[PDB]
Structure formats: C-alpha cells, structure tokens
Amino acid sequence: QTTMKISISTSQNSHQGVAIDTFAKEVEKRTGGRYKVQTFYSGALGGERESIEAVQLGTQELAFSSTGPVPNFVPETKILDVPFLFRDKAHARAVLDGPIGQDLLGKFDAKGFKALAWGENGFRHMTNSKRDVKGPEDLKGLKMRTMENPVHIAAYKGFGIITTPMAFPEVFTALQQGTVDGQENPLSVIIASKFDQVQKHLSLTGHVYSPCIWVMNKAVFDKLSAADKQAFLDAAKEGTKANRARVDEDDAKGVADLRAKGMTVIDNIDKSKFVTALAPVNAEFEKQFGKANIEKIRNYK
C-alpha cells in the first residue's frame, strides 16, 4: 500500500474534517487498500497556502482548501470570489458542478495540480469584538483579518475595512489579543474554531461564497492506474457530498448555536446596502474578469 497525506486548517469535527475523513475512507475502499490516506487537521501541516504550496512542490500529495489562497496559484479562479455573485448555495453548487466549474478545474493542470472536484466552505459572514454591524458604514474603520485573497482584500477595503491578511491558524490568537477587531468566515468555520469565545458580534452578511477545492499533486495523480485515477475522483465527489451536507446542517443550527454561546447575532441583513457600497470596486471586478463571464454565472439555470 501507498500511504498519502491530506491536510486542512479546520477541525475533524467540521465540514472540512468530515470531507477528508470520507475521502480517505473511500480511497481505501475503492482502491482495495492499494492506497491509504492519513488525515491532518487544524493546520497540523500548515495553513492553506502552505499546504497548497506543499502539494505543488510534491512534499505532500493532497489538500482540501478554501479558495482563499488559490488565486496566488491559479488566477482564473478569482471570479468565484466576487461578492454577491451567487444568490444562494443551490446556485453556487449548480455553477461549480456544471460546465463552468468543470472547465475551471482544468485550469489547475498547467500549474502542477490535478483538481479532483469542487467542494464548499460556505457563505462568509462578518464577526467582530467592537460593535453590531447592520450596514456597511458600520464596517468602516474596523481592523479585520482577511485570507490571502486579492479579491476579498480589495472588496473589504471598499467597505472601509483596514485589512490584515493572515494564515488561518494565526486567527484565534489575533482575535484573542485584539490585534484585529474581527474576521469573516462561514458559520461552519466560526463554530468549529470556537470564535464565539473571542467575538461577541456576528452579522449574516453572506457577502461572498467560499468554495473549497480538492487538489492533488499532478505527477502523483498521473502515475495512478486509470482505474485508481477514477477511484480518487469518485472519492473526492463523495467527500464533497459529506462536506455540503455538513455545511447545510451547520447553517441551519448556526444562529441558535452561537446565540446559546453568547453572541449577539444580527440575522436579517439588508444586503442591498452592502452591494451599493461596493459598486465602484465591483465595477472594477466586472472589467477585470469580464461582464460576459459574470453574467453567465449569474444567469446559470
């Protein structure tokens, strides 16, 4: 048997942890034990950028990651990180599972990966330790951690946020020590990382959709037999099913869960106010990634 490694930045008991555990189980079953996959949680093999870099270098075979750091490797994916592009999870999933998403997986080939499938981190929401956020003006002047994503950083600077990019494993301590006022993430991540302990304010801004991607080292993938290549592809699809189911459960439980953990949660956000604030920066995104490409995603089924 060949034993490979896969890593994530969140816990085993999270949407991403159930994803990689399912993937690992399915690889072993479908390859008849020829391959086994050791799982690493909570940044044990580094944050997402470090893990993807390792996969590209070949020091590690696999990673499951949000798209946060992905444009640094594959710039064609940026269009997915545009705020308020996707209406809801059903829209995003349909887009990513259909030809638009499937074509984007192919762009990873030239950068030394096989991208096995798309998965899901979820819609991201603002938290902070200073004040309730009801409109964009409330974001102005907040120091917020961001991922290492240029679309997110430009967008949030558009809200007047003072941005600080950081790898995920450093975020709890930064919030704890007040190095930043806040951050933004899906409810799955806020709950699994226990950010309720260090943030008292949450607003369901849902300001961007955060995909996850399964990446494998291209050379490692290419040396698999044809049948085993298919086993890895199918194991990733099963991992995605588990992943998405967990996101749906976490989004359903999340507001109540966090209220019980002491957060003040603002659950009825008027997103149009935030769209209006972003209009100038959004115009630039549309010009960079192409209005035709944006509208194709918007109008997809």
Contact 116, 254 (CB under 8 A): no
Instruction: Tell me the three-class secondary structure of the chain, residue by residue.
Output: CEEEEEECCCCCCCHHHHHHHHHHHHHHHHCCCCEEEEEECCCCCCCHHHHHHHHHHCCCCEEEEECCCHHHCCHHHHHHHCCCCCCCHHHHHHHHHCHHHHHHHHCCHHHCEEEEEEEEEEEEEEEECCCCCCCHHHCCCCEEEECCCHHHHHHHHHCCCEEEECCHHHHHHHHHHCCCCEEEECHHHHHHCCHHHCCCEEEEEEEEEEEEEEEEEHHHHHCCCHHHHHHHHHHHHHHHHHHHHHHHHHHHHHHHHHHHCCCEEECCCCHHHHHHHCHHHHHHHHHHHCHHHHHHHHCCC
Q: Is 185 labelled a binding residue?
A: yes
* By the rule CB under 6 A, 128 interacts with ligand EAX: no
Q: Which listed residue (48, 81, 120, 181) binds ligand EAX by CB under 6 A?
A: 48
Q: Please enumerate in sequence order all residues whose Cβ is within 8 A of that of 279, keeping only pairs 6 or more positions apart, or say none.
A: none
**Cβ of residue 147: shortest distance to ligand EAX, in angstroms?**
5
Q: Is 282 labelled a binding residue?
A: no
56/65 with CB nearer ligand EAX: 65
Q: Which listed residue (7, 22, 51, 66) binds ligand EAX by CB under 6 A?
A: 66
Q: Which listed residue (68, 136, 211, 254) binds ligand EAX by CB under 6 A?
A: 68
Q: Is 34 labelled a binding residue?
A: no
Count of residues interacting with ligand EAX (CB under 6 A): 11
* By the rule CB under 6 A, 121 interacts with ligand EAX: yes
Contact 246, 188 (CB under 8 A): yes
**Cβ of residue 189: shortest distance to ligand EAX, in angstroms?**
5
The token pair at 72 is 């640094």
What is the contact mask toward ligand EAX in residues 146 to 185, using x (rule: CB under 6 A)?
-x--------------------x----------------x
**Cβ of residue 68: shortest distance to ligand EAX, in angstroms?**
5
* By the rule CB under 6 A, 127 interacts with ligand EAX: no
* By the rule CB under 6 A, 60 interacts with ligand EAX: no
85/231 with CB nearer ligand EAX: 85
**Cβ of residue 10: shortest distance to ligand EAX, in angstroms?**
5
b/e sequence 109-136, b meaning 16+ C-beta within 10 Å: eebebbbbbbbbbbbbbbbbeeeebeeb
Q: Which listed residue (5, 6, 7, 10) binds ligand EAX by CB under 6 A?
A: 10
* By the rule CB under 6 A, 9 interacts with ligand EAX: yes
- Cβ-proximal residue to ligand EAX, closest one: 66
Site for ligand EAX in 179-198 (CB under 6 A): 185, 189
Q: Is 145 labelled a binding residue?
A: yes
Q: Is 16 labelled a binding residue?
A: yes
Q: Is 124 labelled a binding residue?
A: yes
The token pair at 83 is 């705020």
61/81 with CB nearer ligand EAX: 81
Which residues are part of a known binding site?
16, 48, 121, 124, 145, 185
Which residues are part of a known binding site for D-erythronate?
16, 48, 121, 124, 145, 185
Q: What residue ranges bind ligand EAX (CB under 6 A)?
A: 9-10, 48, 66, 68, 121, 147, 168, 185, 189, 210
